[model samples]
Target chain A: VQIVYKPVDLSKVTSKCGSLGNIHHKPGGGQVEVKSEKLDFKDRVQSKIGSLDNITHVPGGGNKKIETHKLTF
Target chain B: VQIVYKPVDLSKVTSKCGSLGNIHHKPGGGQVEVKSEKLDFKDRVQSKIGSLDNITHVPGGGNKKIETHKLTF
Candidate 1:
Protein backbone atom coordinates (compact mmCIF):
# COMPACT_ATOMS: atom_id res chain seq x y z
CA VAL A 1 0.00 0.00 0.00
CA GLN A 2 1.13 3.53 -0.79
CA ILE A 3 1.03 5.79 2.21
CA VAL A 4 0.47 9.53 2.02
CA TYR A 5 0.89 12.04 4.82
CA LYS A 6 -1.17 15.20 4.77
CA PRO A 7 0.43 18.12 6.58
CA VAL A 8 -1.60 20.71 8.39
CA ASP A 9 -1.60 24.43 7.50
CA LEU A 10 1.93 25.93 7.62
CA SER A 11 1.37 29.57 6.72
CA LYS A 12 2.28 30.80 10.14
CA VAL A 13 5.38 28.73 10.81
CA THR A 14 8.37 30.90 11.70
CA SER A 15 11.89 29.63 11.52
CA LYS A 16 14.72 30.21 14.01
CA CYS A 17 15.63 33.23 11.92
CA GLY A 18 12.04 34.40 11.98
CA SER A 19 11.54 33.97 8.27
CA LEU A 20 8.29 32.53 6.95
CA GLY A 21 9.94 31.87 3.58
CA ASN A 22 11.79 28.80 4.74
CA ILE A 23 10.61 25.45 6.06
CA HIS A 24 10.28 21.81 5.06
CA HIS A 25 7.10 19.76 5.32
CA LYS A 26 7.54 16.05 4.79
CA PRO A 27 3.90 15.05 4.48
CA GLY A 28 4.66 12.14 2.20
CA GLY A 29 5.37 9.28 4.54
CA GLY A 30 8.23 11.39 5.91
CA GLN A 31 9.96 10.40 2.69
CA VAL A 32 9.24 13.26 0.38
CA GLU A 33 10.72 16.59 1.47
CA VAL A 34 9.12 19.90 0.61
CA LYS A 35 10.92 23.15 1.25
CA SER A 36 9.28 26.56 1.15
CA GLU A 37 10.16 29.09 -1.52
CA LYS A 38 13.70 30.47 -1.20
CA LEU A 39 14.10 28.29 1.86
CA ASP A 40 17.61 27.23 2.75
CA PHE A 41 19.00 24.47 4.88
CA LYS A 42 22.43 22.98 5.64
CA ASP A 43 24.85 22.61 2.72
CA ARG A 44 25.38 19.44 0.39
CA VAL A 45 24.13 17.54 3.41
CA GLN A 46 21.32 19.00 1.28
CA SER A 47 21.57 21.53 -1.54
CA LYS A 48 22.29 25.01 -2.88
CA ILE A 49 18.60 26.00 -2.61
CA GLY A 50 15.22 25.34 -4.27
CA SER A 51 15.28 21.77 -5.60
CA LEU A 52 14.14 18.14 -5.32
CA ASP A 53 16.95 16.16 -3.75
CA ASN A 54 17.84 12.50 -3.38
CA ILE A 55 15.23 11.66 -6.01
CA THR A 56 17.20 8.61 -6.99
CA HIS A 57 17.85 6.89 -3.66
CA VAL A 58 16.20 6.17 -0.33
CA PRO A 59 17.39 4.44 2.79
CA GLY A 60 14.97 1.50 3.17
CA GLY A 61 12.73 2.07 0.19
CA GLY A 62 15.61 2.03 -2.27
CA ASN A 63 14.51 4.20 -5.24
CA LYS A 64 11.00 5.12 -6.37
CA LYS A 65 9.12 7.55 -8.48
CA ILE A 66 7.78 10.52 -6.53
CA GLU A 67 4.56 11.85 -7.96
CA THR A 68 4.55 15.59 -7.50
CA HIS A 69 1.31 17.52 -7.45
CA LYS A 70 1.79 21.15 -8.39
CA LEU A 71 -1.25 23.17 -7.45
CA THR A 72 -2.22 25.96 -9.82
CA PHE A 73 -5.89 26.51 -8.95
CA VAL B 1 -5.15 34.54 -18.20
CA GLN B 2 -5.22 32.57 -14.96
CA ILE B 3 -3.68 34.05 -11.86
CA VAL B 4 -2.68 31.68 -9.09
CA TYR B 5 -2.26 32.90 -5.52
CA LYS B 6 0.38 30.64 -4.03
CA PRO B 7 0.21 30.79 -0.26
CA VAL B 8 3.16 30.39 2.09
CA ASP B 9 3.69 27.38 4.37
CA LEU B 10 0.86 27.15 6.92
CA SER B 11 1.55 24.32 9.36
CA LYS B 12 1.99 26.67 12.30
CA VAL B 13 -1.07 28.90 12.11
CA THR B 14 -3.31 28.89 15.19
CA SER B 15 -7.00 29.67 14.95
CA LYS B 16 -8.90 31.85 17.41
CA CYS B 17 -10.09 28.70 19.17
CA GLY B 18 -6.63 27.15 18.86
CA SER B 19 -6.81 24.14 16.60
CA LEU B 20 -4.14 23.24 14.09
CA GLY B 21 -6.63 20.80 12.64
CA ASN B 22 -8.57 23.53 10.89
CA ILE B 23 -7.43 26.15 8.39
CA HIS B 24 -7.94 27.22 4.78
CA HIS B 25 -5.59 28.49 2.10
CA LYS B 26 -6.85 29.88 -1.17
CA PRO B 27 -3.96 29.71 -3.63
CA GLY B 28 -6.26 30.21 -6.52
CA GLY B 29 -6.76 33.74 -7.66
CA GLY B 30 -8.79 35.15 -4.78
CA GLN B 31 -11.62 33.11 -6.31
CA VAL B 32 -11.02 29.72 -4.75
CA GLU B 33 -11.31 28.62 -1.11
CA VAL B 34 -9.82 26.00 1.20
CA LYS B 35 -10.40 24.67 4.71
CA SER B 36 -8.83 22.30 7.20
CA GLU B 37 -9.95 19.09 8.95
CA LYS B 38 -13.02 19.06 11.27
CA LEU B 39 -12.96 22.82 10.96
CA ASP B 40 -16.23 24.73 11.47
CA PHE B 41 -17.17 28.10 10.08
CA LYS B 42 -20.03 30.64 10.01
CA ASP B 43 -23.41 29.13 9.11
CA ARG B 44 -25.44 29.23 5.77
CA VAL B 45 -23.37 32.26 5.00
CA GLN B 46 -21.23 29.14 4.47
CA SER B 47 -22.17 25.68 5.64
CA LYS B 48 -22.13 22.92 8.31
CA ILE B 49 -18.45 22.08 7.86
CA GLY B 50 -15.92 20.71 5.34
CA SER B 51 -17.09 21.75 1.85
CA LEU B 52 -16.43 23.77 -1.29
CA ASP B 53 -18.76 26.74 -1.27
CA ASN B 54 -20.02 29.45 -3.55
CA ILE B 55 -18.28 27.23 -6.05
CA THR B 56 -21.13 27.54 -8.47
CA HIS B 57 -20.87 31.30 -8.68
CA VAL B 58 -18.19 33.88 -8.27
CA PRO B 59 -19.29 37.49 -8.12
CA GLY B 60 -17.30 38.29 -11.24
CA GLY B 61 -16.06 34.90 -12.41
CA GLY B 62 -19.35 33.07 -12.15
CA ASN B 63 -20.40 29.62 -13.31
CA LYS B 64 -16.89 28.30 -13.78
CA LYS B 65 -16.24 24.74 -12.76
CA ILE B 66 -13.59 24.64 -10.05
CA GLU B 67 -10.91 22.04 -10.45
CA THR B 68 -10.57 20.15 -7.21
CA HIS B 69 -7.28 18.39 -6.53
CA LYS B 70 -7.18 15.89 -3.69
CA LEU B 71 -3.67 15.25 -2.40
CA THR B 72 -2.66 11.64 -1.88
CA PHE B 73 1.04 12.33 -1.31
Candidate 2:
Protein backbone atom coordinates (compact mmCIF):
# COMPACT_ATOMS: atom_id res chain seq x y z
CA VAL A 1 0.00 0.00 0.00
CA GLN A 2 1.40 3.36 -1.07
CA ILE A 3 0.12 6.96 -0.90
CA VAL A 4 1.63 9.25 -3.48
CA TYR A 5 1.43 13.07 -3.31
CA LYS A 6 0.54 15.04 -6.43
CA PRO A 7 0.66 18.77 -7.12
CA VAL A 8 -2.65 20.69 -6.98
CA ASP A 9 -1.55 23.39 -9.41
CA LEU A 10 -1.73 27.07 -8.38
CA SER A 11 -5.02 28.23 -9.82
CA LYS A 12 -7.30 29.09 -6.89
CA VAL A 13 -4.98 31.08 -4.59
CA THR A 14 -1.34 31.60 -3.64
CA SER A 15 0.85 28.56 -2.97
CA LYS A 16 2.56 28.11 0.37
CA CYS A 17 4.00 24.72 -0.44
CA GLY A 18 3.79 22.39 -3.44
CA SER A 19 4.33 18.78 -4.49
CA LEU A 20 5.51 19.55 -8.03
CA GLY A 21 9.07 19.72 -6.74
CA ASN A 22 11.27 19.98 -3.59
CA ILE A 23 11.26 23.74 -3.27
CA HIS A 24 11.92 23.98 0.50
CA HIS A 25 10.81 27.46 1.42
CA LYS A 26 8.91 29.22 4.23
CA PRO A 27 5.48 27.63 4.16
CA GLY A 28 2.74 30.17 3.36
CA GLY A 29 -0.31 30.85 1.16
CA GLY A 30 -2.25 27.76 0.12
CA GLN A 31 -1.19 28.16 -3.52
CA VAL A 32 1.09 25.13 -3.78
CA GLU A 33 -1.68 22.60 -3.36
CA VAL A 34 -1.10 18.83 -3.13
CA LYS A 35 -3.88 16.28 -3.56
CA SER A 36 -3.38 12.96 -1.81
CA GLU A 37 -5.19 10.21 0.09
CA LYS A 38 -7.06 11.10 3.26
CA LEU A 39 -4.53 11.29 6.13
CA ASP A 40 -6.18 10.22 9.39
CA PHE A 41 -4.17 10.50 12.59
CA LYS A 42 -4.62 9.18 16.09
CA ASP A 43 -5.56 12.61 17.53
CA ARG A 44 -6.51 15.97 16.06
CA VAL A 45 -2.84 16.97 16.25
CA GLN A 46 -1.97 14.84 13.24
CA SER A 47 -4.74 16.60 11.34
CA LYS A 48 -3.32 19.96 12.38
CA ILE A 49 0.29 19.49 11.26
CA GLY A 50 1.49 17.74 8.11
CA SER A 51 3.72 14.63 7.92
CA LEU A 52 6.37 13.20 5.52
CA ASP A 53 6.47 10.26 3.11
CA ASN A 54 8.67 8.58 0.47
CA ILE A 55 6.06 7.72 -2.16
CA THR A 56 6.21 9.49 -5.51
CA HIS A 57 3.95 9.36 -8.62
CA VAL A 58 6.79 7.82 -10.65
CA PRO A 59 9.72 5.62 -9.76
CA GLY A 60 12.59 6.93 -7.58
CA GLY A 61 12.53 10.27 -9.42
CA GLY A 62 13.42 11.96 -6.15
CA ASN A 63 10.14 13.73 -5.43
CA LYS A 64 7.92 13.97 -2.35
CA LYS A 65 4.65 15.66 -1.19
CA ILE A 66 3.83 17.82 1.86
CA GLU A 67 0.36 17.11 3.31
CA THR A 68 -0.71 20.21 5.17
CA HIS A 69 -3.54 20.18 7.70
CA LYS A 70 -5.52 22.93 5.99
CA LEU A 71 -5.33 24.70 2.66
CA THR A 72 -5.64 28.16 4.21
CA PHE A 73 -2.64 27.58 6.44
CA VAL B 1 -2.34 16.93 17.54
CA GLN B 2 -0.16 17.95 14.60
CA ILE B 3 2.80 16.43 12.77
CA VAL B 4 5.08 19.00 11.24
CA TYR B 5 7.83 17.90 8.81
CA LYS B 6 11.03 19.50 10.00
CA PRO B 7 14.24 19.47 7.97
CA VAL B 8 16.50 16.54 8.86
CA ASP B 9 19.64 18.40 7.88
CA LEU B 10 21.63 16.78 5.05
CA SER B 11 24.53 14.94 6.68
CA LYS B 12 23.89 11.21 7.05
CA VAL B 13 23.56 9.54 3.63
CA THR B 14 21.51 10.95 0.75
CA SER B 15 18.03 12.33 1.25
CA LYS B 16 15.44 11.03 -1.18
CA CYS B 17 13.13 13.77 0.07
CA GLY B 18 13.26 16.43 2.77
CA SER B 19 10.93 18.40 5.09
CA LEU B 20 12.94 21.54 5.71
CA GLY B 21 10.94 23.59 3.21
CA ASN B 22 8.60 23.13 0.23
CA ILE B 23 11.27 22.68 -2.41
CA HIS B 24 9.05 20.64 -4.72
CA HIS B 25 11.94 19.45 -6.84
CA LYS B 26 12.73 15.94 -8.07
CA PRO B 27 12.86 14.19 -4.66
CA GLY B 28 16.25 12.51 -4.67
CA GLY B 29 19.57 12.50 -2.87
CA GLY B 30 18.84 11.94 0.80
CA GLN B 31 20.44 15.24 1.56
CA VAL B 32 17.59 16.93 3.40
CA GLU B 33 16.33 15.45 6.67
CA VAL B 34 13.05 15.63 8.65
CA LYS B 35 12.17 14.03 12.01
CA SER B 36 8.46 13.54 12.79
CA GLU B 37 5.99 11.26 14.56
CA LYS B 38 4.96 7.80 13.32
CA LEU B 39 2.39 8.04 10.51
CA ASP B 40 0.38 4.85 10.47
CA PHE B 41 -2.29 4.12 7.83
CA LYS B 42 -5.17 1.67 7.70
CA ASP B 43 -3.59 -0.22 4.77
CA ARG B 44 -0.02 -0.40 3.51
CA VAL B 45 -1.01 1.63 0.46
CA GLN B 46 -1.77 4.70 2.54
CA SER B 47 1.63 4.39 4.16
CA LYS B 48 3.47 3.97 0.88
CA ILE B 49 1.71 6.59 -1.22
CA GLY B 50 1.48 9.23 1.55
CA SER B 51 -1.45 11.60 2.06
CA LEU B 52 -2.50 15.22 2.76
CA ASP B 53 -3.93 17.02 5.80
CA ASN B 54 -5.25 20.42 6.98
CA ILE B 55 -2.78 20.92 9.86
CA THR B 56 0.47 22.79 10.35
CA HIS B 57 2.99 23.72 13.07
CA VAL B 58 1.94 27.34 13.28
CA PRO B 59 -1.53 28.83 13.46
CA GLY B 60 -1.66 29.18 9.66
CA GLY B 61 1.82 28.84 8.21
CA GLY B 62 0.49 27.03 5.15
CA ASN B 63 3.24 24.37 5.41
CA LYS B 64 2.65 20.62 5.28
CA LYS B 65 4.33 17.20 5.39
CA ILE B 66 4.31 14.00 3.32
CA GLU B 67 4.04 10.54 4.88
CA THR B 68 5.75 7.95 2.66
CA HIS B 69 5.84 4.21 3.28
CA LYS B 70 9.57 3.56 3.29
CA LEU B 71 12.32 6.10 3.83
CA THR B 72 14.48 4.34 1.23
CA PHE B 73 12.00 5.23 -1.47
Candidate 3:
Protein backbone atom coordinates (compact mmCIF):
# COMPACT_ATOMS: atom_id res chain seq x y z
CA VAL A 1 0.00 0.00 0.00
CA GLN A 2 1.19 3.48 -0.82
CA ILE A 3 1.14 6.08 1.91
CA VAL A 4 0.74 9.72 1.11
CA TYR A 5 1.54 12.54 3.48
CA LYS A 6 -0.50 15.72 3.28
CA PRO A 7 1.23 19.01 2.77
CA VAL A 8 1.81 20.38 6.25
CA ASP A 9 3.56 23.41 7.66
CA LEU A 10 7.20 22.48 7.99
CA SER A 11 7.59 24.69 11.05
CA LYS A 12 5.12 22.53 12.93
CA VAL A 13 6.94 19.29 12.27
CA THR A 14 10.34 17.73 12.86
CA SER A 15 12.34 15.61 10.39
CA LYS A 16 10.26 16.60 7.41
CA CYS A 17 10.89 15.84 3.74
CA GLY A 18 13.17 18.90 3.92
CA SER A 19 12.73 22.03 1.83
CA LEU A 20 11.36 20.27 -1.20
CA GLY A 21 10.16 21.86 -4.38
CA ASN A 22 7.64 19.88 -6.47
CA ILE A 23 7.32 16.28 -5.44
CA HIS A 24 5.81 13.37 -7.36
CA HIS A 25 4.27 10.43 -5.63
CA LYS A 26 5.14 7.29 -7.57
CA PRO A 27 2.85 4.45 -8.45
CA GLY A 28 4.75 1.72 -6.63
CA GLY A 29 5.49 3.73 -3.50
CA GLY A 30 8.33 6.15 -4.08
CA GLN A 31 8.77 9.84 -4.73
CA VAL A 32 10.34 12.01 -7.37
CA GLU A 33 11.71 15.35 -6.15
CA VAL A 34 11.95 18.46 -8.25
CA LYS A 35 15.25 20.30 -7.70
CA SER A 36 14.73 23.99 -7.26
CA GLU A 37 16.39 26.66 -5.11
CA LYS A 38 13.33 28.87 -5.48
CA LEU A 39 11.30 26.25 -3.66
CA ASP A 40 13.56 26.17 -0.64
CA PHE A 41 11.73 27.46 2.45
CA LYS A 42 13.86 26.43 5.40
CA ASP A 43 15.59 29.79 5.61
CA ARG A 44 12.35 31.64 5.01
CA VAL A 45 10.70 29.80 7.88
CA GLN A 46 13.69 30.42 10.11
CA SER A 47 13.54 34.12 9.34
CA LYS A 48 9.77 34.17 9.77
CA ILE A 49 9.13 35.59 6.29
CA GLY A 50 6.51 32.96 5.55
CA SER A 51 6.83 30.25 2.88
CA LEU A 52 4.86 27.97 0.58
CA ASP A 53 5.38 24.25 0.09
CA ASN A 54 3.69 21.66 -2.06
CA ILE A 55 3.42 17.93 -2.53
CA THR A 56 2.66 17.47 -6.20
CA HIS A 57 1.42 13.91 -5.90
CA VAL A 58 0.13 11.66 -3.18
CA PRO A 59 0.39 7.98 -3.99
CA GLY A 60 -2.45 6.42 -5.98
CA GLY A 61 -5.19 8.02 -4.02
CA GLY A 62 -5.38 11.46 -5.66
CA ASN A 63 -3.84 12.65 -8.87
CA LYS A 64 -4.34 16.16 -7.62
CA LYS A 65 -1.47 17.76 -5.78
CA ILE A 66 -1.64 19.34 -2.37
CA GLU A 67 -0.07 22.69 -1.54
CA THR A 68 0.33 24.49 1.78
CA HIS A 69 2.44 27.27 3.26
CA LYS A 70 3.37 28.83 6.57
CA LEU A 71 3.36 32.46 7.64
CA THR A 72 5.01 33.63 10.82
CA PHE A 73 3.99 36.64 12.83
CA VAL B 1 6.30 41.07 -28.85
CA GLN B 2 4.74 39.85 -25.67
CA ILE B 3 4.81 41.86 -22.48
CA VAL B 4 4.40 40.00 -19.24
CA TYR B 5 3.44 41.44 -15.89
CA LYS B 6 5.39 40.15 -12.98
CA PRO B 7 3.42 38.77 -10.07
CA VAL B 8 3.02 41.38 -7.37
CA ASP B 9 1.26 41.60 -4.06
CA LEU B 10 -2.31 42.57 -4.93
CA SER B 11 -2.55 44.71 -1.86
CA LYS B 12 -0.31 47.26 -3.59
CA VAL B 13 -2.35 47.67 -6.72
CA THR B 14 -5.72 49.17 -7.65
CA SER B 15 -8.17 48.01 -10.34
CA LYS B 16 -6.23 44.78 -10.38
CA CYS B 17 -7.18 41.56 -12.17
CA GLY B 18 -9.62 41.16 -9.33
CA SER B 19 -9.18 38.16 -7.02
CA LEU B 20 -7.70 35.81 -9.56
CA GLY B 21 -6.65 32.29 -8.85
CA ASN B 22 -4.15 30.92 -11.36
CA ILE B 23 -3.65 32.89 -14.57
CA HIS B 24 -2.20 31.79 -17.88
CA HIS B 25 -0.45 34.11 -20.26
CA LYS B 26 -1.23 33.12 -23.81
CA PRO B 27 1.15 33.27 -26.77
CA GLY B 28 -0.70 36.11 -28.47
CA GLY B 29 -0.65 38.61 -25.58
CA GLY B 30 -3.78 37.43 -23.82
CA GLN B 31 -4.41 35.68 -20.52
CA VAL B 32 -6.40 32.66 -19.39
CA GLU B 33 -7.71 32.56 -15.84
CA VAL B 34 -8.04 29.37 -13.85
CA LYS B 35 -11.31 28.82 -12.02
CA SER B 36 -10.72 28.09 -8.39
CA GLU B 37 -12.37 29.08 -5.13
CA LYS B 38 -9.49 27.71 -3.07
CA LEU B 39 -7.20 30.32 -4.57
CA ASP B 40 -9.41 33.24 -3.60
CA PHE B 41 -7.32 35.48 -1.39
CA LYS B 42 -9.26 38.70 -1.46
CA ASP B 43 -11.25 38.02 1.65
CA ARG B 44 -8.18 36.75 3.43
CA VAL B 45 -6.30 39.95 2.68
CA GLN B 46 -9.25 42.03 3.77
CA SER B 47 -9.42 40.11 7.05
CA LYS B 48 -5.67 40.52 7.59
CA ILE B 49 -4.87 36.83 7.49
CA GLY B 50 -2.71 35.91 4.48
CA SER B 51 -3.14 34.66 0.92
CA LEU B 52 -1.44 33.32 -2.20
CA ASP B 53 -2.17 34.13 -5.84
CA ASN B 54 -0.24 32.91 -8.85
CA ILE B 55 0.12 33.98 -12.45
CA THR B 56 0.81 30.68 -14.18
CA HIS B 57 2.02 32.03 -17.49
CA VAL B 58 3.49 35.23 -18.92
CA PRO B 59 3.38 35.56 -22.70
CA GLY B 60 6.28 33.95 -24.53
CA GLY B 61 9.15 35.33 -22.53
CA GLY B 62 9.76 32.44 -20.12
CA ASN B 63 8.20 29.03 -20.15
CA LYS B 64 8.66 29.01 -16.42
CA LYS B 65 5.61 30.05 -14.40
CA ILE B 66 5.61 32.69 -11.69
CA GLU B 67 3.94 32.47 -8.28
CA THR B 68 3.50 35.04 -5.52
CA HIS B 69 1.51 35.42 -2.32
CA LYS B 70 0.77 37.98 0.37
CA LEU B 71 1.06 37.53 4.14
CA THR B 72 -0.34 39.95 6.70
CA PHE B 73 1.12 40.39 10.11
- Sort by DockQ, best first: 2, 1, 3
The candidate, 1 or 2, that scores higher on TM-score is: 2
**What do the candidate models score in CA lDDT, each in turn?**
0.25, 0.30, 0.24
- Give one digit per residue, the lDDT tens place, for model 1 in B24-65: 232122222223344333322211211113121111111222
For TM-score, the strongest prediction is 2
When summed lDDT is taken over every stretch of 10 residues in candidate 2 chain A, the lowest stretch is A54-63
Docking class of 3: incorrect
Candidate 1 structure quality by residue, lDDT tens digits, A1-73 = 3323343333231212211222222212222222234333332331131212312111211122222445322
Stretches of candidate 2 exceeding 4 Å from the true structure: A1-73, B1-30, B46-73
Candidate number that wins on TM-score, 2 or 3: 2
Residue A3, candidate 1: alpha-carbon lDDT = 29
Candidate 2 local lDDT, B10-69, one digit each (tens): 212112322233333222232222334444455333222123332222212222235333
Clashing pairs in 3: none
Off by over 4 Å in 3: A1-61, B1-70
- Candidate 2 has a TM-score of 0.13
Candidate 3, A1-73: lDDT as tens digits = 2323233222211122222223223212122222223232222222111111212221111122223333334
Per the 3 Å backbone cut-off, how many clashing residue pairs does candidate 2 have? 60
